[PDB]
Amino acid sequence: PREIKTLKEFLAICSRKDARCVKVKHNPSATKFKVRCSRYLYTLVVNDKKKADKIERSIHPSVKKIAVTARSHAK
Amino acid sequence: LRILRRLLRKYRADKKIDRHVYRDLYVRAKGNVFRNKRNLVEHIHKIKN
Amino acid sequence: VAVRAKVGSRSYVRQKQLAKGKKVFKIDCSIPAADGIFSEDVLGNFEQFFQDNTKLNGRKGKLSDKVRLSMNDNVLTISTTMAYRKKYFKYLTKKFLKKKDLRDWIRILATGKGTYQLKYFN
Amino acid sequence: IKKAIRKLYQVKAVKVNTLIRPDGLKKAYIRLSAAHDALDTANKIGLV
Amino acid sequence: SCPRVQYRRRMHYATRGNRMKMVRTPGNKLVMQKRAKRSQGIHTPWVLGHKRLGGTKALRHIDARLASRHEKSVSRAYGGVLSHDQVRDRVVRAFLVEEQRIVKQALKEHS
Amino acid sequence: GRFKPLAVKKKYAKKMNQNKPVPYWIRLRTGNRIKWNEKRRHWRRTKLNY
RNA sequence: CGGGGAAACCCAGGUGGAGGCCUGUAGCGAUGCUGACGUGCAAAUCGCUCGUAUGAUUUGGGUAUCGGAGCGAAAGACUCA
RNA sequence: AGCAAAGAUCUAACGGAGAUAUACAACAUGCAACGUUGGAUACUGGAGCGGGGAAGGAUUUCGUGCCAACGGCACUCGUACACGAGUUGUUCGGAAACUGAGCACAACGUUAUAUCGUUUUGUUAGGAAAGUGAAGGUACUGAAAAGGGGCAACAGAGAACCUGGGAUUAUAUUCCAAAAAGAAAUUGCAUGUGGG
RNA sequence: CCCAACUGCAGACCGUACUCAUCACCGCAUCAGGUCCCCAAGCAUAGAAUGCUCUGGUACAUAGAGAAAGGUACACUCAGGGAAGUCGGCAAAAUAGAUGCGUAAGUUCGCAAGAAGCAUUGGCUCUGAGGGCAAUUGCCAACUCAGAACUGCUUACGGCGGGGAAUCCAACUGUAUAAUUA
RNA sequence: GUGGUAAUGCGCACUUGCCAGGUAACAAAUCAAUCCUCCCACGGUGAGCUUUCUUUUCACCAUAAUCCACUUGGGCCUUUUUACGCGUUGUUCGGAGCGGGGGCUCAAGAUUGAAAAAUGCAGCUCGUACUGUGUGAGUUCUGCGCAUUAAAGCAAAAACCUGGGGUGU
RNA sequence: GUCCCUCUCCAAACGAGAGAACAUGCAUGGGCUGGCAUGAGCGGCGAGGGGCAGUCCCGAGGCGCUGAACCUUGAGGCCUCAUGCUCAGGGAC
């Protein structure tokens, strides 16, 4: 897994061809944006709940956006 | 020894004791001269006197 | 343990002191009090039980106020400047229920971080 | 086994796990891609 | 109370290559995990004394191959082979011995 | 053990097939002799050493 | 480290952890009961007792040397009861 | 004769043909024994009647049925018997591809006869065993490299993957499929952008 | 054509069950024999000795009734005497842990030696000594040893040397007749 | 290619034409000791006990690979010169450079993040949502070798690695 | 009438024997007789010790209730000193 520091990366990576998903995890202290691309899983830690929502909109509607939640025994 | 070695390091670093008297005690602490930590200290305070 | 202990010093053992402030525990008796299995008598006995049987330093029955025991409303509260384990008040309650022999009926389980709740068995 | 499953049944097999029974016969578990339904090709043959 | 553990890699004998960690997993279970054999690291030549070099990591097979060339060596001449003292003796010998010839040769020719 | 050549594995594969009992109908062939299989086997006795 | 002596060296307290060294498990053996058993649990086993247990030690896999021959710290031992 | 080492079983309800089985009450006229579950008591006592592997075995594993024979007593149980099923790998072990004590194919020599000997002290053969190609000229020209081929390690060398699971009657670092429960490592080739 | 970070597609072969043993192997067998490796809890204790125990695993070894003689035993005891027994102290008994004092001849100076022998030991309530850290002072852990007062012994788990005076032989450790001689 | 007085730092190329050296590669005892186990401490959840006693007894309290950014032990450089001093439990060391200040590097960790709570476990609520999450005794990974008694001195090769020289020129 | 079943123990390896046959026979209890050595629980003497300011606790032992508690016929002691059980004894020659 890899870390994203600047936000000018999280725009580039999402706009790469391979990235098939962006998983968005909500934590009390921060929210994770987990970009799933082929080799690595790129994540972005915001830490400020205001800035987080605004980023979650800027993500291009092209890429899937999964809300990461607890999944029970669906299977 | 590990108790007697560390009390001499702690004095020489606090300059309660010379490098010359340190080496005079260090070698004796190995010679079973000092029966315990309180015995070492009484002998130092007796040298300063 | 630095100073070696003594027997005979087992009377009045020091207990750690909570330096920040008050700590407060609750015992919620509402459910069984409603059905009459408790009465105003047993609630007067339940508070008294802790008043008599909680042991502050080594000794029980004498609590100066570093710990205060209040029956306000139907819920028992224990406010303490001392450091107690909440586990220990779950202990005294069970030990009270076994004198009344209510213990095949009323169970206690932790509803909230500072409180226990008397209930019934399925 | 990946090729002959493309010939016979015209379905791509993403994963194959071969095995050899104690009987000498070589079983295979062919996983055919999620664009394809294996319950479809089954009734195209058998099955129940 | 000491959960007891089992080998996993198909080799059950314990030699210097099969050495095993104990591991408590997020499922809370103990596990043998194989340690990795570790190289003794880059050394000076045996004849000169076998002491290890500086600025050179202990990387092992496929660890030494995938690492950048700098972790295995040093920039001055004979980087990943000789220590600095063995370099400056071969720098000095190359010089002082070469002139002892240039002087002893001229004398013979001059004579 | 876990180890085996494949050539050896098959020889035990064949010998597992041969342990089946004699079919019921094959007793009813006209002029039949075979009743129960005389070559049957159990690992507890007469061990194949393959 | 200290004490003695002109010298040469000699005494005493610690540290250190040597040995085909001693007690003692596992291990490897197999002394005594001339014990059990002696148509057995067993075509040599069992019980307590006993030898050794940092070494000329014990042990797995592989590999080498055999029939008038092999191998033997030597007993005509052993070489698939 | 005997079936006497390893302490040991007991009770209730349910199962089962195995019963509570009778020509003027019940004991005195259906005995003993079996499985599972709950309870009780006890043993092993981490050098284990614990959990996994090699050698060896090779379906004994797993589920359903079943009691003829077999488990030297007994079974309703079984490692019996019958009928179905079960062993999933880019990374785990081997092999592809290491060398060791060693082995013996070629070669040579012996022998009436190879079914004999030599064959790692750096290495076969009186012995011409290199099929590779530096530099250069455009698939020729010839520097350089002495000592043929192979086997021998599932405990030495070497080896890129980890946990989670509701994924099972039985296999799993083997299975899981778009939120792969997921996270990585590495080999080969290939296009694209960046540089040379 | 090379290099760099990504991406795309592919990643073949064989084993994989179960067993590893008071029933799965060898010993004619589900035989008290034999058989390599890994993991290894709590308390007493010097402890992988030995005793009991939580997790795991077992109640399977043909059973029931049951006081004969005679036996076997990984079972005990005995008045008085104490080797008179017997080829012979065979077998049994005995000794025993730890701490202190003490210890002969002989000697290759290493030993002999745990020679021999004497004494102490519980329980309880205290006391002393043995340190770390932080800035003389303050706060703290983990144990061991010694001493005292009071009080008790029915000498009371398991485990654990009998010792001394001499002769013969081999210097010693070792090996050695698998199944009568170590 | 390029920085630092230096130990060495930073990420155009090709080198199995040739050569040289490394890794692979082996080693006692003492002391310290990793993962991990046990025990104690803290106290959270459930359970056991309750005539009396027990702030109680029992169970659980977990974080895999991979990839990022202070301490301990060694080798070393520069500086100031040392003939008594530094240092270990321990049989040591120094003008062939001890000790001190300041640095370079290596080994084993600690720490903060990515993975990662979305998982695991337990409890509870009317097949769902919530709640909880040590200067102790062992331990051979390691320190650790030109490394053991030794008339014992403790395998080899593939594969990889860096350099010399050269190519680029 | 004898034998079996049943109950007893002067008998007994199994047979056999002595006996009983609604019988203080059996069961339990009481009392004797005997063994051990003063139970659990509780309460105001104790080397010392800890709190709070003399008290209230910690403490092996000790003292009182306490020759107390428990055991006492069973392979099989005593006393009818009490109650309980039996309700056509069954079967075979």
Distance between the termini of chain F: 13 Å
* Annotation, overall tally of beta strands of chain F: 0
Order of helices and strands of chain B: HHH
From the spread of the alpha carbons, the general shape of chain F counts as elongated
- Would you report the number of β strands of chain B? 0
Helical segment count of chain B: 3
Structural class of chain B: mainly alpha
Q: Largest inter-chain interface?
A: D-F, 5 and 8 residues
Radius of gyration of chain F: 15 Å
**Roughly what fraction of the amino acids of chain B lie in strands?**
under 5%
Q: What oligomeric state is this? A: part of a larger assembly
Class from secondary-structure proportions of chain F? mainly alpha
Overall radius of gyration of chain B: 10 Å
> Secondary-structure element sequence of chain F?
H
Strand content of chain F: under 5%
Give the biggest beta sheet of chain B: none
Tally of separate helices of chain F: 1
Overview of this protein structure:
This is part of a larger assembly, with chains A (75 residues), B (49 residues), C (122 residues), D (48 residues), E (111 residues) and F (50 residues). Chain A is α/β, with parallel strands linked by helices and 75 residues long. Chain A is 24% helix and 32% strand. Chain A has two helices and five strands. Chain A has helices spanning 7-14, 49-58, and strands at 2-4, 21-26, 31-36, 41-45, 64-67. In chain A, 9% of the residues are buried. Chain B has helices at residues 2-13, 19-30, 37-48. In chain B, helix 1 (2-13) packs antiparallel against helix 2 (19-30). Chain B is globular and about 25 Å long. Chain F is mainly α and 50 residues long. The longest helix of chain F is centred in the first third of the chain and has 12 residues, at 6-17. Chains in contact: D-F. Chains D and F meet through loops of D and helix 1 of F. Chain E binds five RNA strands through strand 1 and strand 2. It is classed as ribosome.
Give structural attributes:
part of a larger assembly; 6 chains; A: 75 residues; alpha/beta; five-stranded mixed β-sheet; 2 helices; 24% helix; E: 111 residues; alpha+beta; two-stranded antiparallel ribbon; 2 strands; rod-shaped; RNA-binding; Ribosomal_eL39 (chain F)
